[PDB]
RNA sequence: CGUAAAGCGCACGCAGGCGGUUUGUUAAGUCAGAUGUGAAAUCCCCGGGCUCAACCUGGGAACUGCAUCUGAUACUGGCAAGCUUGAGUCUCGUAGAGGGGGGUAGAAUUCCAGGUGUAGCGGUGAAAUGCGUAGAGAUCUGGAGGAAUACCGGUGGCGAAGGCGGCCCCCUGGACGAAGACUGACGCUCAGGUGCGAAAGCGUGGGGAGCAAACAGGAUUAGAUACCCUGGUAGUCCACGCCGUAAACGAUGUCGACUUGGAGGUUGUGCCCUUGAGGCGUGGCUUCCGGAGCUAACGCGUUAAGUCGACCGCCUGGGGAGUA
């Protein structure tokens, strides 16, 4: 059953640009939305929408910097299964720090640039390379 | 708008998900291209070509199927350009070097033919190199006098002409392809998403192309 | 399966009105009835393994419904195993 | 983990693991800070003393931990309330070798009785054993009995898998479709457990036409405990119980999501002059070929062996050995 709409969220974003496709849509919650701004704040979407009223839509207009796909690589780390808390030091860069790794804060959904600065770790969710 | 007058698209069978972007698509199981897309694609591919053409560069127009000849010696030797009309040979890019002396075989063959010896010693041996002259003359036709590999390539059909899209691309040459709703853009730099197979189609076609490629700066 | 008016009936006596048919009472109630007919129609036959098959779906759903409504509401969990007859 | 070792034969399901979506509260996990502790030596860093080094040594860092207190509340959990996109119920139909019980029908094989009729029949590569003037084989009539159900029949259908094929009745399971209503996360997987599970086999009682392990004879052969021939018992068939396995195989666990196409098959449904054996869609199941991608390759390829998530099962060189 779906038991990770987050990993799920990733894998319509692999698998769009995978097929060169222009836009994703999916079902929409605070989550999705928090980590689509995270998202489109360090460029790897163009931009999101979210529509709908009783069934929520979140959209995503997905970048393509030359004929290449702009996310190279999205994982999906703390999955259901196997929770990953990391620690303000323990808090990894990605990519040698050119490439995102979300984590959810609990001062908010962050970057691991953003929460590192912030002084404070939490749950790693993605790690966009 | 209308400069494409008498094509619409083509190839009900065996169309190519790539070509989508180009599909207007309607009538009667067959697949109209957008032309509307065509005429911005063309105007590129005469800027770029022309652009090239008045560098002092070798065009290379490619018309295997028929008739595309000889509508492409037609259209190349209305230029002062060159052609393939007949079965291109596979590797005379990417091989140019072997294909060099098999050129240089159908020169000596015509200065010894129609000036030299010909008559000379045998008619059963004269008759063998005579026919050496038609199979030599009709392979190597119109790149006999190019002298280089060319500076740019003109495919009228990108699936029936893949091997030479696959070697100018293996080369770095920019490929001008008309590709139809079977075709697939592999290479071919400069797309354009027309009809392959009418005649019509490909003698306005070629007339755009030949008229922008005899303009250099004159 | 079960007749129309014997699943109309189910509807009537357990739901809150008519067209109250997928509550959680109706078809514990619905499952029950069919669980019983068919109890009728394995004591003969016996090897008709493939409708049984069927029975045990039926038994292992009213199962779950039970367990659902037992753990949102207790009153209405008592009061419908004490009404069914169920539970032994 | 398709083919190298590796997906339980298939399901149901307890404990376990995981769990859509919104709001409020808590703050257990999680995070931040503080305090107490984490002995000294040792490791590490910056210095100092032995002529240097090993060695000794000063200060720090570290000891990744635990406990308590103070906070943060995004995620996970607890609690309360919901919501429908998951799951399920109801209405109406559809197709089907799904299952169990009962009945019946027609071809054919064998046997029995009788008519005609006469010298072979059967069999094989060739033969012989075998049957036959006590009248076979062929042929016609009548009867008995058992098993299986030609044609339809189709990479057709149904079933979780094993599997299910005349026709009719009775009892019964599931699937799918159309519109609408209802419940409201009731879900997914599943170790142990339980059930179903071809064929052969076993037990008790029937049945026994054909076929046929064993067995016997004839050949073949160097031999022939075989292949071939002629017979032929258990068995195959029924009732009830056992067994519990197969190359139980798509050698591919289950459930869910996403990702270019083409040609079919089968079963629904909606719309349009139905102006016909049409045109346009929209579902369910299924076959072949192929794109990206993956793959050791072969190939798989929207029914994935692609891109992910949840849970389970299993693998760790060959043999010995799936044996003691």
């Given amino acids: ?129 | ?218 | 399966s079960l007749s129309t008016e014997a699943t109309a009936k189910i509807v009537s006596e357990f739901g809150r009105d008519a067209n109250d048919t997928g509550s959680t009472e109706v078809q514990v109630a619905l499952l029950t009835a069919q669980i019983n007919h068919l109890q009728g129609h394995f004591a003969e036959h016996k090897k008709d393994h493939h409708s049984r098959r069927g029975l045990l779906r039926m038994v292992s759903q009213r199962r779950k419904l039970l367990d659902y409504l037992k753990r949102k509401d207790v009153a209405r969990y008592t009061q419908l195993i004490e009404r069914l007859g169920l539970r032994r």
């Fill in chain 1, 1 to 129: 059953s779906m038991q990770d709409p987050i990993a799920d969220m990733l894998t319509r974003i692999r698998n769009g640009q995978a097929a060169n496709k222009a836009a994703v849509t999916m079902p929409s919650s605070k989550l999705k939305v928090a980590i689509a701004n995270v998202l489109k704040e360090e460029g790897f979407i163009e931009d999101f929408k979210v529509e709908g009223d009783t069934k929520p839509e979140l959209e995503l207009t997905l970048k393509y910097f030359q004929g290449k796909a702009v996310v190279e690589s999205i994982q999906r780390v703390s999955r259901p299964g196997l929770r990953i808390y990391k620690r303000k030091d323990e808090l990894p860069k990605v990519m040698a720090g050119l490439g995102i790794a979300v984590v959810s804060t609990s001062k908010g959904v962050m970057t691991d640039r953003a929460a590192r600065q912030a002084g404070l770790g939490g749950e790693i969710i993605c790690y966009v390379a």
């Fill in chain 2, 1 to 218: 708008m209308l400069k494409a007058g008498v094509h619409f698209g083509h190839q009900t069978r065996y169309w190519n998900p790539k070509m989508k972007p180009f599909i207007f698509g309607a009538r009667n199981k067959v697949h109209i291209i957008n032309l509307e897309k065509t005429v911005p694609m063309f105007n590129e591919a005469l800027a770029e070509l022309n652009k090239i053409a008045s560098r002092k560069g070798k065009i290379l127009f490619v018309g295997t199927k028929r008739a595309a000849s000889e509508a492409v010696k037609d259209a190349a030797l209305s230029c002062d350009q060159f052609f393939v009309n007949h079965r291109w040979l596979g590797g005379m890019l990417t091989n140019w070097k072997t294909v060099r002396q098999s050129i240089k075989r159908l020169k000596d063959l015509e200065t010894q033919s129609q000036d030299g010896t010909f008559d000379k010693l045998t008619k059963k041996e004269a008759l063998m190199r005579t026919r050496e002259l038609e199979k030599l003359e009709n392979s190597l036709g119109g790149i006999k006098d190019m002298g280089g590999l060319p500076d740019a390539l003109f495919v009228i059909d990108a699936d029936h002409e893949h091997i030479a899209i696959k070697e100018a691309n293996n080369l770095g040459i920019p490929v001008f392809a008309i590709v139809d709703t079977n075709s697939d853009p592999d290479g071919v730099d400069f797309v354009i998403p027309g009809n392959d197979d009418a005649i019509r189609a490909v003698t306005l076609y070629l007339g755009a192309v030949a008229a922008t490629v005899r303009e250099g700066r004159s």
